[PDB]
Amino acid sequence: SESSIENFLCRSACVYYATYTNNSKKGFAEWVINTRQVAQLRRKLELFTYLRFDLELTFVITSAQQPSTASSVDAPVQTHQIMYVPPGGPVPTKVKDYAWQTSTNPSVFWTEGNAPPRMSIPFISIGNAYSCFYDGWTQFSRNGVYGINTLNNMGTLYMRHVNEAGQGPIKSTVRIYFKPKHVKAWVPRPPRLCQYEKQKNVNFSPIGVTTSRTDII
Amino acid sequence: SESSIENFLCRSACVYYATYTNNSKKGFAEWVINTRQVAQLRRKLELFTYLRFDLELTFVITSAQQPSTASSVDAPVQTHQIMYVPPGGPVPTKVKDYAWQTSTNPSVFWTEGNAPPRMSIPFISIGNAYSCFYDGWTQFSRNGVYGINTLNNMGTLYMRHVNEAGQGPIKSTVRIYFKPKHVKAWVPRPPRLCQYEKQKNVNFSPIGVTTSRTDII
Amino acid sequence: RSITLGNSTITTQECANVVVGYGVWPEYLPTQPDVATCRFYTLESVQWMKNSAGWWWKLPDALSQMGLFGQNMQYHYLGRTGYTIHVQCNASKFHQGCLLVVCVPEAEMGCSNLNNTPEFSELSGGDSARMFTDTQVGESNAKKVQTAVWNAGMGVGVGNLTIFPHQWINLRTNNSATLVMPYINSVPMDNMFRHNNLTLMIIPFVPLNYSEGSSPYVPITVTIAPMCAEYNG
Amino acid sequence: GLPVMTTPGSTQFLTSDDFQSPSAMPQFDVTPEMQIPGRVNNLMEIAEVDSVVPVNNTEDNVSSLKAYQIPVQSNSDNGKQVFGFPLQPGANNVLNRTLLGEILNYYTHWSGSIKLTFMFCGSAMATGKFLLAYSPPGAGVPKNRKDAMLGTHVIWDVGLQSSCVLCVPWISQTHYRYVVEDEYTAAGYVTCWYQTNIVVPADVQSSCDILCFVSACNDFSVRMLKDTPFIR
Amino acid sequence: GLPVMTTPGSTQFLTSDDFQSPSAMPQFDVTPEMQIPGRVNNLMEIAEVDSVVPVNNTEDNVSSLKAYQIPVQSNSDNGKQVFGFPLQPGANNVLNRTLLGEILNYYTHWSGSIKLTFMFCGSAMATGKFLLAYSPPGAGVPKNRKDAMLGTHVIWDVGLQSSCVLCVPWISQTHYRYVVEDEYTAAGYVTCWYQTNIVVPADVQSSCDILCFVSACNDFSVRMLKDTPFIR
Amino acid sequence: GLPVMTTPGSTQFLTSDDFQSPSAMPQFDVTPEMQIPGRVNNLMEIAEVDSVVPVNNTED
């Protein structure tokens, strides 16, 4: 029963790691949600063609004092905003922007020294299953690029400090965790042989089938 | 079922943002509760004439060390007071005033580093429904100004530091969130075309009906 | 024997074994056609020579120029169709070889240049077999499909291709193959000018070999028949 | 006391939660409800009423009441077009600022039908005939009256009936085709054609006008709310 | 209020827990399920299908389709070996990249059986005989046909049957012996031997080939998942 | 939400407690028990067997 689909895929994996400082006026994080980021979880999810799962994310945020000038740098506790843009929503560009303050981008606000901020996303897609492989062009668009399938779009995530600060600069890292839940899988698939070259496509270089030996006997 | 009245209006929206420093002797926040502050929530609430809803507010308070003089600025945790004046109550003017200490202005006291301080206001009005649009003059007054309707008065909010401080000045921001609850709506209305000019009235400049095209065929 | 659909007739053996998809028969749920679309569209024959490598047909594009099915697609884009594929090669008892006949759903393919992505005239030829090569397509080309046979064009090992619904053609003992594929897609009715939801591959594992004097080719004949089709008009 | 254990995601403010809350003013005894007429239970009741479509935008009639009227006269040319508008959604079409198009810009995916009532606001003595032709997505705009006749059409007698109803579908997503490109061919058209001229008695004016309404025929299906683009 | 008491291990993130979580998007009404064919309920259904084993690696056939074919001819030497491969797991054996060996590298302890179907892809007129000998763990590789006959063997008639099935066990752990050391003696071998020559008519080619498949005979028993070594 | 109130002695580690604990490896399916002979249920069974007393210590 350790070879079930749930016990094979319901795990956790650090999928992103980004830093953002509070004073540089271009410091805020950004991650487009996909599965093709880490090469060890991508290979387990590409054994099936159609998948359907809930999602569950947990963020592990730290901080570090950057070297200020002088005269008793003291600081209160910090608070972070972790915004979730749904598929087809507005997108920030600066750290001070309208698109943070909107009403259908459900943020979470979280202060230091507490439990980490877990939030759960349901299965959001217009279709009936996510498709790991799509042979065809970009549907519902005027110009199409091969094998994109804009219907398995899951969202984006944006993070920033909500504390203004003047005395000491503070940079902060984040480690987004990732966990499928209630997984259903259809149409199995052979396991990938060659190395993963890029992220958006299945391009490869051809390699031999297996490891050589000196004779057949 | 995503076109219900509750699922269209029970959302959250940052409606105010103000700062207050603890030492300047005129630093304390103030917000008169209305709906006409943000232009994206005002347009959704003006599709109906009469509304009736509970309210639910949540405050996201931070801090920032202002540059003091010297010699080891250290500070304990801070505590804030968030007072709610009902419609027809006393109103502070200075940060040290009697009207903070009164008994029918229900405050909340909250220290840093905890969960944010949510409080809920019921439907408080003498009438039976809030009116987004009122054609007529100010009832129950000696002199009347057009389209005011003093019966949909919801209150005021005031915030300040309850910690005296001498070493390092501390300024603090606040983001009041806003969420209707158990919404009932009556008498629908066409959606607003022209730009919102001012807050107290429905004055406008006349604009065309729709976007032009080069021919009718 | 002597099965007939519309105005077309083929003949198969009665003691044949047909493999049916993932265990399910194609069935209806929209305008339902059965008037000039339920007939056997015989594609032209390819010749299995000695130094051959393989062939692939993208499935709802090979029938896009064939008849009124090729005109039902132009006036009705959305639709959901099953299939039925007969492949039979006719070689004598003095030839030898072995073919693998798979049907690969969502066979996304790789490019020769690593950055780019392949074009339409290299993915699918309408009613014409595109063929693998036993060599490596070099990276100097711009948009060409990486058609090395042992990686099956998809970066995956060609031995493991038997997880898809397949059938072996062994010229010592067998002659034909029959595949019944149902409708496999995420959305219930998809576009059809931008989505090739099946791919029929024929790959020779053990090559053709014969003595001197025999016919130096063996022709393979593919017959596709859209069963349980519909559209949205 | 009792042993508890706080999970991750505990002291956080998720701005789309549903928890209880302490009431800031108890003991108040709020005023009870009153039967006010016209209660909206759903936003698909603002959609089912019908509003007038500004078919005649034309770059200087938009700041006027001439944007709503389609001009109709009696000319000397046998067979011509009265109007025609596409159905490609969002891209500045005429059904955008109407009472239906202001709701469906608060959503991202919607799919349903449309009623399109017309009305001949001309004299009571004028008589004629009109073609109301709908081109399905994929088929182009018709160019003659004859090939507009061969598609889907309802031939409208003015003297017998002063209002015609033409029910079409309308989908948020437009299925393009890979090779043939044009700004709106896979959307549809609701173009209309002069079948006969307008024959009128003496001492009656010939130049009439037509109004055009839009509604929702059956119930829609909207999903994934967002914010409208009709704001600064 | 109510008295509680927080135990140790309370505000911690254990990355293998199972707690509830607040949903980031309620009120959404997700799209319901659809009957898509071919549902995988367990990873022991990818294992039961059979794939072709690259028995003929040989240092320059690995980038080809010649790695899958075992060459068979008709020589002038009475009794010789066709092929032979060990069963020592993990250490670069031929069943490693197959459809079974890609699942069992996601685990650490597994134990079960194996089907090994063969297939003679030669002419329909050629006739011969083959020995299929399995040496159990502890017994060495056989060196003659005679002592290969005395072990476990299935003698395969080519003209009567074009496919033979030989079912062996395969265990993750190899019980070594203390004194006698060799790289794989306590693993097994599936070596195969020429019983007779290949007798063929005129105008038929003599050099044939053999394919070899592998599967899982009964159900396996895997435990303690890990990550695969087939990555950078 | 629900109102609670944390008593004294709450975030402490008393090294002789008995509380539940989150399992670090779920979904594992451990190996079941086997009848191994000679099960000790109590330390008063090591005592009831008899051993020889060194009565004759005597320094060498």
Task: Looking at this protein, list some descriptive labels.
part of a larger assembly; 6 chains; A: about 220 residues; mainly beta; seven-stranded antiparallel sheet; four-stranded antiparallel sheet; about 5% helix; D: about 230 residues; 1 helix; elongated; virus
Largest beta-sheet details of chain A: 7 strands, antiparallel
Work out the count of structural domains of chain C: 1
Number of helices of chain C: 3
The proportion of residues forming helix of chain C, as a percent range, comes to under 10%
**How large, in whole angstroms, is the Cα Rg of chain A?**
21 Å
What is the straight-line distance between the termini of chain A?
38 Å
Total strands of chain A: the figure is 11
Q: What count of domains describes the coordinates of chain A?
A: 1
Instruction: State the major sheet of chain C.
Output: 6 strands, mixed
Strand content of chain C: 15-25%
Name the helicity range of chain A: under 10%
The structural class of chain A is mainly beta
Biggest interface pair, counts: A-E, 59 and 59 residues
Shape of chain C: globular
**Briefly, what CATH class of chain C?**
Mainly Beta
Query: Number of helical segments of chain A?
Result: 2
Q: How much of the residues of chain A is beta strand, in percent?
A: 25-35%
Listing every helix as H and every strand as E from the N terminus to the C terminus, the arrangement of chain C reads: EEEEEEHHEEHEEEEE
Oligomer: part of a larger assembly
Distance between the termini of chain C: 36 Å
Give an account of the 3D structure:
This is part of a larger assembly, with two copies of chain A (217 residues), one copy of chain C (233 residues) and three copies of chain D. Chain A has 217 residues and is mainly beta. Chain A has one domain (1-217). In chain A, 6% of the residues lie in helices and 29% in strands. Chain A is built from two helices and eleven strands, in the order H-E-E-H-E-E-E-E-E-E-E-E-E. Chain A has helices at residues 5-9, 39-45; strands spanning 16-21, 29-32, 48-59, 64-65, 79-85, 108-111, 119-121, 130-131, 156-161, 170-177, 181-188. In chain A, the strands form two sheets. In chain A, strands 1, 3, 4, 7, 8, 10 and 11 form a seven-stranded antiparallel β-sheet that branches. The longest helix of chain A has 7 residues, at 39-45. The two termini of chain A are 38 Å apart. Chain C is mainly β. Chain C has one domain (3-230): Sandwich (Jelly Rolls). Helices cover 6% and strands 25% of the residues of chain C. In chain C, strands 3, 4, 5, 7, 11 and 13 form a six-stranded mixed β-sheet that branches. Chain C has a five-stranded antiparallel β-sheet with strand order 9-6-12-8-10. In chain C, strand 1 (3-5) and strand 2 (8-10) form a beta hairpin. Chain C starts with a strand and ends in a 9-residue tail after the last strand. Chain D is mainly beta. Helices cover 2% and strands 24% of the residues of chain D. Chain D has one helix spanning 145-149; strands at residues 2-4, 13-14, 39-40, 51-52, 70-72, 81-83, 111-121, 129-134, 152-157, 165-171, 192-194, 208-214. The termini of chain D are far apart. The interface between A and E is large, with 59 and 59 residues. Strand 11 of chain B pairs antiparallel with strand 3 of chain D. Chain F: Belongs to the picornaviruses polyprotein family. Chain F: This is Genome polyprotein. Chain F: It is found in: Host cytoplasmic vesicle membrane; Host nucleus; Virion.
